[PDB]
């Protein structure tokens, strides 16, 4: 009750008192205002000029409680808008928080970890500034224990979260040397048994692999792919989501990087992913498949072997539209790179009817994508002299009706592709 619901005016009076206990009491009152459920008065606290005082309190080794209260207050200011986070940084908080990482008081060290994560979480500039002030070494030192399970759960979760923010964002991506410095600790966190730590570790990995092939390679070379595939089969959606995100990112890389995903057994999980009740998981999984079918013929063959073509037919037939689009891309990629035999297999699995039904879409690019796939499939039928059987299959399911109509479509490319298909096969 003593420090509950103070006015900002009263907080200022206590902080300007030069009585350390009065200052502590007022800092706690500020912390409570900034910790309330609704609409913390962050701007009012900033406008009152309190940040420089809070920052000074961080350095009071002799009074650990005011260190904690001010770290908490500053954490919450930094949790706000970019302008609010900037106010904290502008007050000199970064080095002050880094100094607290070494505190003998675990709850203070943890609060500093948290504050630094909010700062880094603002964007690449503040992320990189936190790194330049030397945060990585002391952060990693806190996790340098024989067994992570000895750490307090909350403490470990906060450390993992802050590390993930240091891996986050691009333009630019985090410094290469910082990434190399963090990765081994991250790989270790990825093997921990706490669902929250696992989720954030997967998120960190997903950020690191969201980039050019060189960034992907740094992660893949650490040998984490098999563990990612294991997490891909997790029961918890908060783990599956970032695990799948990372796996998808990895397969945007070279064909060799993709093979690592296949070799680790990722494809066996796709029957479940491609029918997952969460729309986003189906979409991400189908996008991922589309990048796998963009690979080598031996990689398309593994998609075939794992029985995934019927699942792609399923998604084309019925799924959220965004997912059906990724499915269309998966098919066009498949038909572009596949062998005649692989392409023929596509038709036998029933690809043609759901492809035709999607020509009723108002999305211009997926019509292009679908028309491309049909061209590709026809090309394969040519080599077999079976073009006629395909033309009929397409007309029987109403596909010819759709294509002919697409000659008076206002997009140039579909105009051409349409007439050309008619001209050649109908």
């Amino acid at each position: 009750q003593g420090t509950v619901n103070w006015s900002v005016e009263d907080i200022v009076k206590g902080i300007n008192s030069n009585n350390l206990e009065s200052q502590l009491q007022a800092t706690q009152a500020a912390r409570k205002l900034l910790s309330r459920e609704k609409q913390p008065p962050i701007d009012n606290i900033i406008r009152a000029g309190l940040i420089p005082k809070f920052v000074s309190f961080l350095g009071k080794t002799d009074c650990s409680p005011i260190q904690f209260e001010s770290a908490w207050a500053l954490t919450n200011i930094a949790s706000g808008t970019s302008e609010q986070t900037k106010a904290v940084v502008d007050g000199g908080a970064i080095p002050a928080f880094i100094s607290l990482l070494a505190s003998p008081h675990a709850h203070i060290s943890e609060q500093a970890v948290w504050a630094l994560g909010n700062i880094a979480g603002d964007g690449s500039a503040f992320r990189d500034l936190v790194i330049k002030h030397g945060a990585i070494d002391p952060l990693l030192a806190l996790l340098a224990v024989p067994d992570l399970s000895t750490l307090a759960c909350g403490y470990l979760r906060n450390l993992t979260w802050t590390l993930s923010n240091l891996c986050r964002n691009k333009n630019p991506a985090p410094p290469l040397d910082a990434v190399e410095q963090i990765l081994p600790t991250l790989v270790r966190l990825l093997h921990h048994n706490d669902p929250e730590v696992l989720a954030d570790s997967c998120w960190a990995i997903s950020y690191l692999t969201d980039g050019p092939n060189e960034r992907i390679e740094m992660v893949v070379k650490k040998g984490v792919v098999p563990q990612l595939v294991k997490l891909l089969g997790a029961t918890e959606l908060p783990i599956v989501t970032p695990a799948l995100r990372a796996i998808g990112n990895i397969v945007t890389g070279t064909d060799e990087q993709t093979q690592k995903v296949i070799d680790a057994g990722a494809l066996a999980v796709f029957p479940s992913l491609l029918t997952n009740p969460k729309t986003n998981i189906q979409k991400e999984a189908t996008w991922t498949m589309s990048n796998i079918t963009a690979g080598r013929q031996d990689q398309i063959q593994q998609v075939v072997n794992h029985g995934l073509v019927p699942f792609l037919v399923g998604v084309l037939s019925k799924a959220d539209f965004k997912t059906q689009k990724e499915a269309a891309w998966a098919i066009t990629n498949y038909t572009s790179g596949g062998t005649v035999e692989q392409i023929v297999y596509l038709v036998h699995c029933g690809i043609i009817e759901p492809l035709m039904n999607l020509l009723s879409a108002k999305d211009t690019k997926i019509i292009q994508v679908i028309l491309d796939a049909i061209s590709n499939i026809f090309q394969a039928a040519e080599k077999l002299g079976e073009t006629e059987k395909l033309s009929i299959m397409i007309e029987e399911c109403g596909g010819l009706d759709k294509i002919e109509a697409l000659q008076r479509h206002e997009n140039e490319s579909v105009y051409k592709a349409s007439l050309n298909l008619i001209e050649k096969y109908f």
């Binding site: 910790s35 913390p40 706000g80 994560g117 909010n118 990112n249 945007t252 891309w329």
Partner: peptide, 23 residues
């Protein structure tokens, strides 16, 4: 024919910052 993530999409929707409301 690989397609990387579109520049207009976010990195997955996770909170960038966290406010501490309890101890």
């Amino acid at each position: 024919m690989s397609r990387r993530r579109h520049s207009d999409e976010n990195d997955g929707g996770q909170p960038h910052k966290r406010r501490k409301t309890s101890d």
